Amino acid sequence: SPDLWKIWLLIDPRRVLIAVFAFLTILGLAIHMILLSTTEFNWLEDGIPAAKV
Amino acid sequence: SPDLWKIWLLIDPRRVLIAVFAFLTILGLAIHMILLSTTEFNWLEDGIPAAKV
Amino acid sequence: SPDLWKIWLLIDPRRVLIAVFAFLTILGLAIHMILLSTTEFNWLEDGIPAAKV
Amino acid sequence: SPDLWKIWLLIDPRRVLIAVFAFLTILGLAIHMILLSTTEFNWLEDGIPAAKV
Amino acid sequence: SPDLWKIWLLIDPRRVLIAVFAFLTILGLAIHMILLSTTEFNWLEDGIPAAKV
Amino acid sequence: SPDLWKIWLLIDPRRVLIAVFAFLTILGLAIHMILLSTTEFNWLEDGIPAAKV
Amino acid sequence: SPDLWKIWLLIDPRRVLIAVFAFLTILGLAIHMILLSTTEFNWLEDGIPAAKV
Amino acid sequence: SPDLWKIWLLIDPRRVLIAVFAFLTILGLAIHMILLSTTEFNWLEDGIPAAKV
Amino acid sequence: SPDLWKIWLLIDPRRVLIAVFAFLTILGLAIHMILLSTTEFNWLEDGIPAAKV
Amino acid sequence: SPDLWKIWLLIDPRRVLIAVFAFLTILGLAIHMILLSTTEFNWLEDGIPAAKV
Amino acid sequence: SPDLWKIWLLIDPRRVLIAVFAFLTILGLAIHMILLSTTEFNWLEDGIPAAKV
Amino acid sequence: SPDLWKIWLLIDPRRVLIAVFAFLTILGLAIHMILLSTTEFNWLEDGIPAAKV
Amino acid sequence: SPDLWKIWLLIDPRRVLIAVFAFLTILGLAIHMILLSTTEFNWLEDGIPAAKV
Amino acid sequence: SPDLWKIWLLIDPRRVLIAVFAFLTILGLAIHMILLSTTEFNWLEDGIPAAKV
Amino acid sequence: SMTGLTEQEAQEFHGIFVQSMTAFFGIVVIAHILAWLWRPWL
Amino acid sequence: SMTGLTEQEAQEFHGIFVQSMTAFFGIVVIAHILAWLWRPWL
Amino acid sequence: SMTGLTEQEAQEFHGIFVQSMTAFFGIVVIAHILAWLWRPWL
Amino acid sequence: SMTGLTEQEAQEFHGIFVQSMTAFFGIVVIAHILAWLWRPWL
Amino acid sequence: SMTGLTEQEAQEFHGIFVQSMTAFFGIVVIAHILAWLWRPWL
Amino acid sequence: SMTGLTEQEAQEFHGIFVQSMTAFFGIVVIAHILAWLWRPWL
Amino acid sequence: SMTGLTEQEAQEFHGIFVQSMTAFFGIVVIAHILAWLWRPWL
Amino acid sequence: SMTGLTEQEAQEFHGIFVQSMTAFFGIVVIAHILAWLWRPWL
Amino acid sequence: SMTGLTEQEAQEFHGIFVQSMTAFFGIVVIAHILAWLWRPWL
Amino acid sequence: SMTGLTEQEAQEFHGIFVQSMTAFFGIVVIAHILAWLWRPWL
Amino acid sequence: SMTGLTEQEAQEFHGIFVQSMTAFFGIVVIAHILAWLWRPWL
Amino acid sequence: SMTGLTEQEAQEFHGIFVQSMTAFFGIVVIAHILAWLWRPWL
Amino acid sequence: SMTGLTEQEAQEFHGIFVQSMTAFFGIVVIAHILAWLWRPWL
Amino acid sequence: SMTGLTEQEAQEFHGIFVQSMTAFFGIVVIAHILAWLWRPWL
């Protein structure tokens, strides 16, 4: 929609920016936790490259 | 109904938009958690493609 | 009753709409949970179609 | 009693309607839980029609 | 007592009606719970008529 | 005492009626529960008349 | 003391009546509970008269 | 002391009476509980006179 | 000190009588509990005079 | 210091007296508990003089 | 966007600075903790350089 | 410093006195507890002088 | 940046100083705890120099 | 910095003194706890000088 | 009086209250007769 | 007086209260006689 | 009226309330007939 | 005095209170005699 | 009235509400037919 | 004074209080004599 | 009306809302087609 | 001073307080002499 | 309007918002391409 | 001053306080001498 | 605008903010290069 | 200054405070010498 | 400005702040060199 | 300024503060030298 810019006349741009940044940060943290909770995608505990400890 | 636009004269568009966005985000998170809690649809632990760890 | 429209002079249409939407969403979520909690109707764990994991 | 309509001069019709709707919904949910908690009337886990899982 | 109607000059008829309805509903629910908690009067688990599950 | 009626000039008749009704209901419920908690006076689980279940 | 009636000029007769009735009810309930908690004075679980159950 | 009556010019007679009655009641209840908690002075559970149950 | 009576110009005589009475009662209760918790000084369970139960 | 009496121009004599009395009582109770918590200085459980129970 | 400086006309620079500093500190602490919770990247318990204890 | 007396122009002498006395009392209690928790310095449970119990 | 001094026109120097001092103290305590929780860097339990106890 | 005395124009000298004293006391207590929790530096349980208990 | 109702209002409420209570008691009595015919408890 | 009731009001309320209590006690007595016939406890 | 309704409003609400309740009761009855034909419980 | 009661009111209340307490005590005494005949505890 | 709506407002809201509810019920009926074809429960 | 009582009021209250306390102590003494006769504890 | 919006404002917001919802539904439909091709669940 | 008592009031209260405390300590002494005769603890 | 922003203000904020969101999405797409090259999940 | 006491008031309170504390300390010294005779701890 | 800052103030803060962020990012990049040389994780 | 004390007041309080500190420290030192003679810890 | 400080005073605080931070960092660097000499961790 | 102290007041407080801190640090240094002579930890 060409008039999608009018949404900022309805929802506060500053509150939306704060909420978007906070949600994206929480989402990234959650995804990294989910990946680290798995065995196939825990890049820290994987053994690659070959271990030292 | 052709007069379905009249619903915005009753429920506030801003609160409706905020609630819709929040509910859809929560629903997506819940569906992804439900799929990951299964064995057939946990795309991270399914072993496809073939594991490295 | 032909005069069933008069109920909106008694109960607030906006509050009724909000309550109806929330209750329907909660009811759908609850029914999907009940179906997933069973074995015969958990469409994600039923093994159908044939499993890959 | 022919004058049973006079009860709406005492108890608020809107409050009574909302209480009746909420109580009936809760009662239906409770009955469905009670039936699903039984083996004889859990229509989901009964085995009828013959199972696929 | 022929003057038992005067009790409504003392206790509020609407409050009494609300309390009576609530108490009767709770009492019926409690009695049905007590009956279902027993084996002889649990009409759902009694096996009559003959079971299908 | 012939002037036992004067007690209603001291304690509010409506409050006394409400308290008496509530206390009598609670007492009756308590007695029925105490009888049900025994074996000799649980008329529901006594075996009399002869069981079906 | 012949002037013991003067105590009602000090302690409120309605409050004393309420407290006395409540305390006597609680005391009677407590005594009946203590007797039921024993074996010799539980008239319900005693075996007298001879049991049916 | 002959002037011990002057204590009522200092501590409220009504509050003192209420506190004394409450404390004496609690003390009697506590003593009866302590006696009933012992084998030698539980007059209910003692066996005297000779038991029926 | 001969001027020990001046302490009542400093601390309120009624608050001290209440504190003193309450503290002495609590102290007596505590001492009797301590003695009853011992074996040598539990005069109720000591065996003296010779038991009946 | 000869001018140690000047401390009562800073700290309230009444509050200091109350605190001192309370602290001394608590300290005495605590010390008696500590002595009773030991075997060597529990004068009630020591067996001295020779026991009767 | 060359007009990205206009974001400071919407979100308070001091609040953003405080939030950014706090979030970065928490993020660094969390990353260091995650690394220490592993075996391959716990630089304190890895055994390199060779131990003394 | 010769002008160390000026600290009482900054911190309230009465509040400092209360804090110092409370802290010193707490510290002494804590040290006596620490010593009693040990075996080498619990002078009460030490065995010295020779026991009677 | 040459104009980094202007940050003190935005964040209060006193609050920044207090927060920095508190955070640095907490961070130092945390690092010393982390080192003491390991075996290789617990300088108190490492056995160097050679133990007496 | 020769102008380090100016820090007392921002942070209250009395508050800083109170906080510094409290923090130093807590730090000393914590260090003593850490030392006593170890075997090497518990001067109370180290057995030096030679034990009597 | 205490409830703000008139005497006529109290009498008419009493009449309708007792009528409704009697109807409820009759329904309850029929239900209990059916329950006794189904499974007597005494 | 203290409750705001008149002496006549108190007398008539007391009469109705004692009548209702007597009726309730009579129903309770019939129920307890039935219970004793069904299963005596002493 | 303690509710603010008029007598005509109370009557006309009662008519619609009773009719809607009757329709709801009729749907519950057919559902219960279907449930009894499916799996009788007594 | 401090309860708002008159001296005559206090005397009257005391008389009725003591009469009611005596009646309650007599009923309690009869009940305890019955309980001792049923099952003595000492 | 009590909600502040006009009678015409209430009528038009009721019409749109029943149209939307009918559409929702039709979609739900199609979904349930598909579910019964997929896996009948009775 | 501090309680608002008169000196005569305090005197007469003290008299009645001590008389009632003496009566209570005499009943408790009789009860304890009976308890000692029933089962001595020392 | 009760939200402060005019009729034209409500109409244009409804148009944009439905257009955005349709675009979201199209993206969701493409995602579900991809998920069915990847791993069908029925 | 800060309690509202006069010097004479304080000195008469002190006299009565000490007399009562002395009487209390006399009963406690007899009680402790009796307890020592019954069962010495040291 | 409801947020107090001018239409020109809303237009320019929308432009900058979409540009920043496009840049963020491009960075995320590069990151996910790298993640797929490192370790594909499907 | 800060407590509201006069210098003479503070002096006399200090004198009485020191006398009472000395008496308390003397009783505690005998209590401790008696305890040491009963059972020394060091 | 809504933060109370002037456009020139916003531009200067943005410049200093981005300079500080670039310096922090460069330090972080050096630290991560050192961490990869020390112990690569991929 | 900010405590309401005068310079002379602060000086004399400091003198008495340090004298009391010295007395307390001397008592503590004597106690610790006695403790070391009784049972040295180092 | 926003904190109430003058430009000269922010530049003064900043100079002293950076000097103190540099001194603290130098002490920390010496401590870390000593720690590395004592027990290297990498 | 922010604390209400004068520049001379701040200077004198800083001097006394650093003197007291130096004395405390010297006492701490002596204590740590004694601790090292007692039981070295490194």
Ligand SMILES: COC(C)(C)C/C=C/C(C)=C/C=C/C(C)=C/C=C/C(C)=C/C=C/C=C(C)/C=C/C=C(C)/C=C/C=C(C)/C=C/CC(C)(C)OC
């Ligand atoms: C001019 O007008 C007026 C009215 C103002 C004049 C009047 C003035 C007057 C009368 C002044 C009176 C002043 C007085 C009586 C002052 C008394 C002061 C005293 C007795 C001070 C004592 C101070 C003691 C101190 C501060 C001790 C500190 C000890 C510390 C901090 C110990 C710490 C230990 C730690 C952290 C850990 C130890 C090891 C543990 C215990 C944990 O065990 C392993």
Ligand SMILES: COC(C)(C)C/C=C/C(C)=C/C=C/C(C)=C/C=C/C(C)=C/C=C/C=C(C)/C=C/C=C(C)/C=C/C=C(C)/C=C/CC(C)(C)OC
């Ligand atoms: C004049 O203007 C106006 C507007 C006022 C006129 C209008 C008047 C109108 C319209 C009046 C309407 C009145 C109505 C509708 C009245 C309805 C009354 C009803 C239905 C009354 C019902 C009463 C039922 C009672 C009181 C039941 C009591 C049951 C009891 C106490 C049960 C106790 C059970 C016990 C203690 C134990 C049971 C054992 C268990 C089962 C719990 O365990 C084994």
Ligand SMILES: COC(C)(C)C/C=C/C(C)=C/C=C/C(C)=C/C=C/C(C)=C/C=C/C=C(C)/C=C/C=C(C)/C=C/C=C(C)/C=C/CC(C)(C)OC
């Ligand atoms: C003048 O204007 C007006 C408007 C005021 C005129 C109108 C007047 C009217 C209409 C008056 C109406 C009055 C009414 C309806 C009065 C009703 C009175 C009733 C029903 C009274 C009932 C009383 C029942 C009593 C007090 C029962 C007491 C039972 C007790 C205390 C039981 C105790 C049990 C114990 C302690 C232990 C039991 C052992 C267990 C079973 C718990 O364990 C083994």
Ligand SMILES: COC(C)(C)C/C=C/C(C)=C/C=C/C(C)=C/C=C/C(C)=C/C=C/C=C(C)/C=C/C=C(C)/C=C/C=C(C)/C=C/CC(C)(C)OC
């Ligand atoms: C111009 O003025 C105005 C605006 C006022 C005019 C407008 C008037 C209008 C439009 C009126 C509209 C009225 C409507 C729509 C009324 C609808 C009424 C309905 C649907 C009523 C339904 C009632 C159903 C009831 C009360 C059911 C009660 C069931 C009970 C109490 C069941 C109890 C069960 C128990 C206690 C236990 C059962 C066994 C369990 C479930 C425990 O399982 C073992």
Ligand SMILES: COC(C)(C)C/C=C/C(C)=C/C=C/C(C)=C/C=C/C(C)=C/C=C/C=C(C)/C=C/C=C(C)/C=C/C=C(C)/C=C/CC(C)(C)OC
């Ligand atoms: C005149 O000016 C204005 C502005 C007012 C004009 C505008 C008017 C407009 C635009 C109106 C718009 C109206 C709309 C959009 C209305 C939409 C209505 C809808 C979608 C209604 C839907 C209703 C559905 C209902 C009420 C469903 C109820 C279902 C129930 C109660 C199910 C109960 C189930 C139970 C108790 C148990 C089930 C089984 C278990 C327990 C297993 O489930 C978990």
Ligand SMILES: COC(C)(C)C/C=C/C(C)=C/C=C/C(C)=C/C=C/C(C)=C/C=C/C=C(C)/C=C/C=C(C)/C=C/C=C(C)/C=C/CC(C)(C)OC
């Ligand atoms: C006139 O002036 C102004 C300023 C107002 C003009 C401006 C107007 C503008 C710019 C308007 C903009 C509007 C926009 C952006 C609208 C966007 C609308 C969207 C994206 C709508 C999306 C709707 C999606 C819906 C309603 C989805 C519903 C999903 C449901 C209810 C799912 C239920 C799932 C259940 C019950 C169960 C699932 C299974 C579980 C997960 C439980 O188990 C497997």
Ligand SMILES: COC(C)(C)C/C=C/C(C)=C/C=C/C(C)=C/C=C/C(C)=C/C=C/C=C(C)/C=C/C=C(C)/C=C/C=C(C)/C=C/CC(C)(C)OC
């Ligand atoms: C002038 O106008 C007026 C109206 C004021 C005139 C009227 C004046 C009147 C009438 C005055 C009346 C005064 C009265 C009645 C005074 C009564 C005073 C009494 C009875 C005082 C009693 C004092 C008792 C004391 C202080 C006891 C203290 C006991 C202590 C501190 C015990 C401590 C125990 C410890 C620390 C440890 C025990 C060992 C444990 C139990 C812990 O382990 C075995």
Ligand SMILES: COC(C)(C)C/C=C/C(C)=C/C=C/C(C)=C/C=C/C(C)=C/C=C/C=C(C)/C=C/C=C(C)/C=C/C=C(C)/C=C/CC(C)(C)OC
């Ligand atoms: C001029 O006008 C007026 C009205 C003001 C004149 C009137 C003046 C009057 C009448 C004044 C009266 C004054 C009185 C009665 C004063 C009484 C003073 C007393 C009795 C003071 C007693 C003081 C005792 C003290 C402070 C004891 C302190 C003991 C301490 C701190 C012990 C500490 C122990 C520790 C830390 C550890 C022990 C070992 C543990 C128990 C922890 O483990 C075994």
Ligand SMILES: COC(C)(C)C/C=C/C(C)=C/C=C/C(C)=C/C=C/C(C)=C/C=C/C=C(C)/C=C/C=C(C)/C=C/C=C(C)/C=C/CC(C)(C)OC
């Ligand atoms: C004109 O007048 C005035 C006074 C206004 C002029 C003055 C202006 C001044 C002096 C301005 C000063 C500005 C300054 C000092 C700015 C400093 C800016 C800095 C340092 C910015 C730094 C930003 C860093 C960011 C935003 C980093 C973000 C990182 C994120 C979001 C990382 C997320 C990671 C996730 C979600 C998951 C990662 C993996 C985990 C950690 C979970 O582990 C597996």
Ligand SMILES: COC(C)(C)C/C=C/C(C)=C/C=C/C(C)=C/C=C/C(C)=C/C=C/C=C(C)/C=C/C=C(C)/C=C/C=C(C)/C=C/CC(C)(C)OC
């Ligand atoms: C104009 O008038 C006035 C009055 C204003 C003039 C006066 C001005 C004056 C006197 C100014 C004085 C200023 C002063 C004294 C400033 C002092 C500044 C200092 C000391 C600054 C120090 C800063 C240190 C910083 C920022 C350190 C940061 C460290 C960080 C963020 C570490 C993070 C570590 C992480 C995330 C993880 C570590 C891993 C662990 C160890 C936790 O786990 C493995």
Ligand SMILES: COC(C)(C)C\C=C/C(C)=C/C=C/C(C)=C/C=C/C(C)=C/C=C/C=C(C)/C=C/C=C(C)/C=C/C=C(C)/C=C/CC(C)(C)OC
């Ligand atoms: C002039 O105008 C007016 C309106 C004022 C005139 C009207 C006056 C009227 C109408 C007055 C009416 C008065 C009434 C009705 C008075 C009723 C009085 C009654 C019934 C009094 C009853 C008293 C009973 C008492 C106090 C019983 C006490 C029992 C005690 C304290 C038991 C304690 C037991 C203990 C602590 C220990 C052992 C028990 C356990 C269970 C622990 O043993 C194992």
Ligand SMILES: COC(C)(C)C\C=C/C(C)=C/C=C/C(C)=C/C=C/C(C)=C/C=C/C=C(C)/C=C/C=C(C)/C=C/C=C(C)/C=C/CC(C)(C)OC
């Ligand atoms: C002039 O106008 C007016 C209105 C004021 C005139 C009216 C005056 C009137 C009418 C006055 C009426 C006064 C009355 C009725 C007074 C009644 C007073 C009574 C009955 C007093 C009774 C006192 C009993 C006492 C003080 C008992 C104390 C017992 C104690 C403290 C026991 C403690 C036990 C302990 C701490 C330790 C051992 C017990 C345990 C249970 C622990 O052993 C195992």
Ligand SMILES: COC(C)(C)C\C=C/C(C)=C/C=C/C(C)=C/C=C/C(C)=C/C=C/C=C(C)/C=C/C=C(C)/C=C/C=C(C)/C=C/CC(C)(C)OC
């Ligand atoms: C005219 O005057 C002024 C001052 C107004 C001019 C100034 C305007 C300016 C300067 C504007 C600046 C605007 C800026 C900087 C905008 C930046 C916007 C950005 C970066 C937007 C980014 C958006 C990203 C989105 C919306 C991402 C959404 C992701 C979602 C919803 C993901 C959901 C995932 C779910 C629910 C499910 C699966 C994920 C899990 C983790 C569960 O899978 C396992």
Ligand SMILES: COC(C)(C)C\C=C/C(C)=C/C=C/C(C)=C/C=C/C(C)=C/C=C/C=C(C)/C=C/C=C(C)/C=C/C=C(C)/C=C/CC(C)(C)OC
């Ligand atoms: C002009 O008019 C007036 C009235 C203002 C003049 C008067 C001025 C006066 C009288 C001024 C008086 C000033 C005074 C008395 C100042 C006293 C200053 C003192 C004693 C300063 C002491 C400072 C000590 C410091 C800052 C110690 C810091 C220690 C730290 C931060 C330790 C941290 C440790 C960490 C985080 C990590 C490791 C430790 C652990 C325990 C974790 O290792 C295992």
Ligand SMILES: [Ca+2]
């Ligand atoms: Ca790796």
Ligand SMILES: [Ca+2]
């Ligand atoms: Ca996969």
